[PDB]
Amino acid sequence: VIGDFNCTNFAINDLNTGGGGISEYVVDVSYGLGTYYILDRVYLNTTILFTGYFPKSGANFRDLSLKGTTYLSTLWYQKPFLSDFNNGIFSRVKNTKLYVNKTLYSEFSTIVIGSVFINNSYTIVVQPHNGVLEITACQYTMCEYPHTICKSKGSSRNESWHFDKSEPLCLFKKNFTYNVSTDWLYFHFYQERGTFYAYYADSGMPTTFLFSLYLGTLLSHYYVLPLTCNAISSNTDNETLQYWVTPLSKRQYLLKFDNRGVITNAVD
Ligand SMILES: *[C@@H]1O[C@H](CO)[C@@H](O[C@@H]2O[C@H](CO)[C@@H](O[C@@H]3O[C@H](CO[C@H]4O[C@H](CO)[C@@H](O)[C@H](O)[C@@H]4O)[C@@H](O)[C@H](O[C@H]4O[C@H](CO)[C@@H](O)[C@H](O)[C@@H]4O)[C@@H]3O)[C@H](O)[C@H]2NC(C)=O)[C@H](O)[C@H]1NC(C)=O
Ligand SMILES: CC(=O)N[C@H]1[C@H]([C@H](O)[C@H](O)COC(C)=O)O[C@@](O[C@H](CO)[C@@H](O)[C@@H]2O[C@@](O)(C(=O)O)C[C@H](O)[C@H]2NC(C)=O)(C(=O)O)C[C@@H]1O
Ligand SMILES: *[C@@H]1O[C@H](CO)[C@@H](O[C@@H]2O[C@H](CO)[C@@H](O[C@@H]3O[C@H](CO)[C@@H](O)[C@H](O)[C@@H]3O)[C@H](O)[C@H]2NC(C)=O)[C@H](O)[C@H]1NC(C)=O
Ligand SMILES: *[C@@H]1O[C@H](CO)[C@@H](O[C@@H]2O[C@H](CO)[C@@H](O)[C@H](O)[C@H]2NC(C)=O)[C@H](O)[C@H]1NC(C)=O
Ligand SMILES: *[C@@H]1O[C@H](CO)[C@@H](O[C@@H]2O[C@H](CO)[C@@H](O)[C@H](O)[C@H]2NC(C)=O)[C@H](O)[C@H]1NC(C)=O
Ligand SMILES: *[C@@H]1O[C@H](CO)[C@@H](O[C@@H]2O[C@H](CO)[C@@H](O)[C@H](O)[C@H]2NC(C)=O)[C@H](O)[C@H]1NC(C)=O
Numbered sequence: 001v002i003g004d005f006n007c008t009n010f011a012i013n014d015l016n017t018g019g020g021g022i023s024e025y026v027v028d029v030s031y032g033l034g035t036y037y038i039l040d041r042v043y044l045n046t047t048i049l050f051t052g053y054f055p056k057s058g059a060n061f062r063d064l065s066l067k068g069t070t071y072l073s074t075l076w077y078q079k080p081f082l083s084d085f086n087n088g089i090f091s092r093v094k095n096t097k098l099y100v101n102k103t104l105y106s107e108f109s110t111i112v113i114g115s116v117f118i119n120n121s122y123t124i125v126v127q128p129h130n131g132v133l134e135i136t137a138c139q140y141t142m143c144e145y146p147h148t149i150c151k152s153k154g155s156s157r158n159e160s161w162h163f164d165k166s167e168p169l170c171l172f173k174k175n176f177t178y179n180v181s182t183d184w185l186y187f188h189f190y191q192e193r194g195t196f197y198a199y200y201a202d203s204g205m206p207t208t209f210l211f212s213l214y215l216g217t218l219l220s221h222y223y224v225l226p227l228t229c230n231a232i233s234s235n236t237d238n239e240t241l242q243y244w245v246t247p248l249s250k251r252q253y254l255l256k257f258d259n260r261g262v263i264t265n266a267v268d
């Protein structure tokens, strides 16, 4: 289980849907994937050695996205999906572009980051709402079996990942825009000295700083929430979710900057 609040018992079962296991893909930073822009600095037409929170090159990404329809498997709310946060993670996220009456809509998995997922501790949550990325850090009463929905196409169940009837205490609450038309989003989430840090990019590969947040407590787990939808499958539209993650660590990279300050290449 993620939290411990019994939000519902509707359509829960124990089926091992991952008969083929967690899907994997290989980290390759040679085109600037996994890198981020350094503070407020600009470098031009040059190569820098820099030490930062980066992926290991030639490590695996894991796809932790989980599309459901009606039933939720209890096995989705355990290891290997519930994952140790350590120093941090890098995410490569497919923007699942759907259509209704030729209008475009953007969906992708919510991620939660925390320690015990109980309302006496802060949980960070990052959730898309069709071009608005809502980010919060609050004492959420997380469910046992949290999940989200396709607000665009609809779902066979209502949304529930927390159960707070009155607004919980929050250290942070902001919205950030993202371009609904791009195919990928990239994120770094990491912690140093009890402060959480977030970088993203919705265009290109090198990420840029969103925010930082003092927690005063070590984060220790993260989890990518299942998404339930009447769309997003081979019998209806051949679309897919993907939410690739890999661990960060303190590493030295060569970074190459072009003559307009974009990071074009890197070496581990
Ligand atoms: C912070 O997070 C914690 C969890 O970590 C929350 O604690 C839980 O709070 C709920 C709500 O108060 C407790 O709910 C339990 O409900 C049982 C009945 O549930 C059914 O019926 C009710 C209507 O009566 C429906 O609302 C519900 O949806 C279900 O259909 C009760 O039986 C439970 O009673 C317990 O105590 C009696 C003795 O007094 C025993 O006989 C019972 O067997 C049982 O042990 C209870 O009322 C839930 O139990 C709480 N869990 C824990 C671990 O404490 C906090 O509420 C939350 N804080 C804030 C501010 O939101
Ligand atoms: C994490 C994972 O494994 N995710 C897959 C999902 C689950 O394994 C399954 O949900 C588990 O179920 C449990 C735990 O009991 O199966 C999906 O594929 C289904 C067939 O496997 C799909 O075709 C559905 O077929 C139906 O016969 C039915 O109900 O399963 C009718 C329903 O309308 C239709 N869904 C639609 C229209 O999207 C799906 O989607 O649900 C593809 C997802 O990638
Ligand atoms: C950040 O972005 C989110 C997502 O867009 C904003 O949340 C949404 O805010 C609106 C306005 O408060 C909510 O609409 C209201 O909902 C109630 C309940 O259904 C209804 O009675 C009102 O008439 C009105 O429609 C909306 O529900 C809410 N959530 C979602 C998923 O859209 C949020 O306001 C933005 N700002 C901040 C600082 O978070
Ligand atoms: C979790 O909460 C659900 C309700 O959302 C509980 O299910 C009810 O259990 C009582 C036990 O007396 C039954 O009379 C009801 O018919 C059940 N359903 C509903 C809709 O209330 C469930 O027992 C709780 N606990 C667990 C471990 O699932
Ligand atoms: C960017 O740096 C490169 C590499 O130093 C520069 O390329 C050289 O440019 C000179 C002419 O100024 C040529 O004679 C060399 O043959 C080039 N070397 C290579 C490896 O291509 C480039 O001029 C710089 N551009 C800017 C705008 O700073
Ligand atoms: C939002 O994302 C789309 C897709 O990446 C961007 O569209 C591209 O824009 C450039 C010019 O800036 C064109 O050369 C490409 O041909 C466009 N691609 C497609 C598929 O249309 C769009 O510019 C982005 N807009 C913002 C405001 O970020």
Ligand SMILES: *[C@@H]1O[C@H](CO)[C@@H](O)[C@H](O)[C@H]1NC(C)=O
Residues within 6 Å of the ligand: 010, 156, 157, 158
């Ligand atoms: C969804 O919410 C509506 C309105 O509260 C309720 O009538 C319905 O039973 C709920 N369905 C599920 C599966 O939670």
Ligand SMILES: *[C@@H]1O[C@H](CO)[C@@H](O)[C@H](O)[C@H]1NC(C)=O
Residues within 6 Å of the ligand: 234, 235, 236, 237, 238
């Ligand atoms: C999904 O793709 C397969 C392979 O091309 C095809 O057989 C199937 O009919 C497609 N279904 C839809 C809804 O596009």
